[PDB]
Design an enzyme around this catalytic site. Structure first.
Site, short mmCIF file in Angstrom:
data_model
loop_
_atom_site.label_atom_id
_atom_site.label_comp_id
_atom_site.label_asym_id
_atom_site.label_seq_id
_atom_site.Cartn_x
_atom_site.Cartn_y
_atom_site.Cartn_z
N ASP B 25 0.81 -1.21 0.00
CA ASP B 25 0.00 0.00 0.00
C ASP B 25 0.85 1.27 0.00
OD1 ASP B 25 -1.80 2.00 0.22
OD2 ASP B 25 -2.82 1.21 2.00
N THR B 26 1.10 1.80 -1.19
CA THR B 26 1.92 3.00 -1.31
C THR B 26 1.28 4.26 -0.74
OG1 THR B 26 1.18 3.45 -3.58
CG2 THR B 26 3.18 2.11 -3.29
N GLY B 27 -0.03 4.22 -0.51
CA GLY B 27 -0.71 5.34 0.12
C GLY B 27 -0.68 5.32 1.64
C1 LIG Z 1 -13.97 0.81 -3.12
N1 LIG Z 1 -13.01 1.71 -3.78
C2 LIG Z 1 -12.26 2.47 -3.00
N2 LIG Z 1 -11.39 3.36 -3.48
C3 LIG Z 1 -10.66 3.81 -2.45
C4 LIG Z 1 -9.74 4.78 -2.40
C5 LIG Z 1 -9.06 5.05 -1.22
C6 LIG Z 1 -9.39 4.31 -0.09
S1 LIG Z 1 -8.54 4.57 1.43
O1 LIG Z 1 -8.03 6.00 1.52
O2 LIG Z 1 -9.46 4.22 2.59
N3 LIG Z 1 -7.25 3.52 1.54
C7 LIG Z 1 -7.57 2.09 1.48
C8 LIG Z 1 -6.57 1.31 2.34
C9 LIG Z 1 -5.99 2.24 3.41
C10 LIG Z 1 -7.31 0.15 3.04
C11 LIG Z 1 -6.10 3.87 0.70
C12 LIG Z 1 -4.89 4.01 1.61
O3 LIG Z 1 -3.68 4.11 0.85
C13 LIG Z 1 -5.09 5.25 2.49
C14 LIG Z 1 -5.08 6.52 1.63
C15 LIG Z 1 -5.13 7.63 2.48
C16 LIG Z 1 -4.03 8.47 2.59
C17 LIG Z 1 -4.11 9.60 3.41
C18 LIG Z 1 -5.27 9.86 4.14
C19 LIG Z 1 -6.38 9.04 3.99
C20 LIG Z 1 -6.31 7.93 3.16
N4 LIG Z 1 -3.97 5.36 3.43
C21 LIG Z 1 -4.07 5.28 4.76
O4 LIG Z 1 -5.11 4.94 5.32
O5 LIG Z 1 -2.94 5.59 5.45
C22 LIG Z 1 -3.06 5.57 6.87
C23 LIG Z 1 -2.11 4.51 7.40
O6 LIG Z 1 -0.79 5.07 7.15
C24 LIG Z 1 -0.90 6.52 7.23
O7 LIG Z 1 -0.52 7.09 5.95
C25 LIG Z 1 -1.57 7.97 5.49
C26 LIG Z 1 -2.61 8.05 6.60
O8 LIG Z 1 -2.33 9.20 7.42
C27 LIG Z 1 -2.38 10.43 6.67
C28 LIG Z 1 -3.67 11.19 6.99
O9 LIG Z 1 -3.85 12.34 6.59
N5 LIG Z 1 -4.56 10.52 7.73
C29 LIG Z 1 -5.87 11.16 7.93
C30 LIG Z 1 -2.37 6.81 7.43
C31 LIG Z 1 -10.40 3.37 -0.19
C32 LIG Z 1 -10.98 3.11 -1.36
O10 LIG Z 1 -11.94 2.20 -1.71
#
Ligand SMILES: C/N=c1/[nH]c2ccc(S(=O)(=O)N(CC(C)C)C[C@@H](O)[C@H](Cc3ccccc3)NC(=O)O[C@H]3CO[C@H]4OC[C@H](OCC(=O)NC)[C@H]43)cc2o1
Ligand SMILES: [Cl-]
Ligand SMILES: [Cl-]
Ligand SMILES: [Cl-]
EC number: 3.4.23.16
Lengths: 99, 99
Positions: B25-27
């Site tokens: 998960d690059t996000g």
């Molecule tokens: C059905 N189709 C869809 N499409 C779709 C598209 C997206 C999503 S998604 O977003 O739920 N998500 C699904 C994964 C995570 C299961 C993607 C994921 O990579 C999120 C992305 C993101 C990055 C930053 C903030 C919010 C979300 N990352 C994330 O959770 O990160 C958390 C853990 O590590 C920290 O790094 C970042 C964040 O803190 C930073 C911040 O500012 N927090 C508030 C923290 C679900 C989806 O379903």
């Protein structure tokens, strides 16, 4: 390009003639942007993440440039914490993970 | 390997003597796993994603094996709906995005 992951993989996208920053996100099925205006009709979608669900507006067949790479596809608009480019568009621009 | 993004990029990890399935998960900044036991010190943390925040336990310096690749780093444990491998561990196995 080859993008390492020591920092967030933030890229510039262009949508509706405007530049935005967005996160290349292999953990996202779909692409979700912060509130904005798009054309045409939208359909409802619920998408879930770490903290639970949000409701978004689904727009189809929307042109969007990602790092200069042209895509046309589904963009979800709603109260996301950050713009995220998900696999629906990462596949359009030929993105893979490699190690 | 080169990992397509047509499907969710799921891998097997070995952690704390357990085998678990997780999403590359690059996000995600951080690796976040469903409830499990880990040894050593920990401190509480809030992390936020789509839908808001959850409380997790932060463990540091945890050995993990991903695709035969050994790495060590921080693992957050709590009520995530799915196990994610975040950038903090993806860097260690030399994972890059490419297009
Ligand atoms: C059905 N189709 C869809 N499409 C779709 C598209 C997206 C999503 S998604 O977003 O739920 N998500 C699904 C994964 C995570 C299961 C993607 C994921 O990579 C999120 C992305 C993101 C990055 C930053 C903030 C919010 C979300 N990352 C994330 O959770 O990160 C958390 C853990 O590590 C920290 O790094 C970042 C964040 O803190 C930073 C911040 O500012 N927090 C508030 C923290 C679900 C989806 O379903
Ligand atoms: Cl699409
Ligand atoms: Cl770490
Ligand atoms: Cl490197």
């Amino acid at each position: 390009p080859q993008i390492t992951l020591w920092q967030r993989p933030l890229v510039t996208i262009k949508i509706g003639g405007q530049l935005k920053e967005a996160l290349l996100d292999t953990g996202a099925d779909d692409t979700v942007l912060e509130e904005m205006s798009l054309p045409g009709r939208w359909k409802p979608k619920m998408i879930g993440g770490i903290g639970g669900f949000i409701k978004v507006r689904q727009y189809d067949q929307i042109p969007i440039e990602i790092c200069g790479h042209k895509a046309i596809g589904t963009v979800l608009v709603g109260p996301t914490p950050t713009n995220v480019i998900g696999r629906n568009l990462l596949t359009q621009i030929g993105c893979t993970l490699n190690f």
